[PDB]
Nucleic acid binder design. Structure first.
Length: 52
DNA sequence: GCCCTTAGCCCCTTGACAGGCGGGAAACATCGTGTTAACCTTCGATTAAGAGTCGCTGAGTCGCGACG
């Protein structure tokens, strides 16, 4: 369904054991947006999972 | 019972078509060109809600020493 999503990572793709909390808003028709974090504790706008 | 004579079958010679592949000659549908010059000189999708790993790159941290 269209709307913002916050998929907290379950440890996978983490530095050691930390979570990611990828805040992604899925539009009904358009380009996806990802506001996930990293091990450096920084929010990166991974638009449509292309770049970070 | 054997030899002569004649009939039937097989074979040869000619032939009057019949039309039949096929190139030619011709009537007709293709296939690659042109050519015209009145106005816009960045078009657009598409992953991206699982998962084990190959191949490369570029930042922050240290040694060895020289010159005051």
């Amino acid at each position: 369904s269209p709307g913002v999503f916050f998929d907290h990572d379950k440890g996978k793709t983490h530095a050691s054991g930390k979570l990611l909390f990828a805040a992604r808003v899925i539009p009904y028709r358009g380009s996806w947006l990802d506001f996930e974090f990293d091990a450096k504790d920084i929010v990166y706008v991974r638009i449509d999972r292309r770049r970070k």
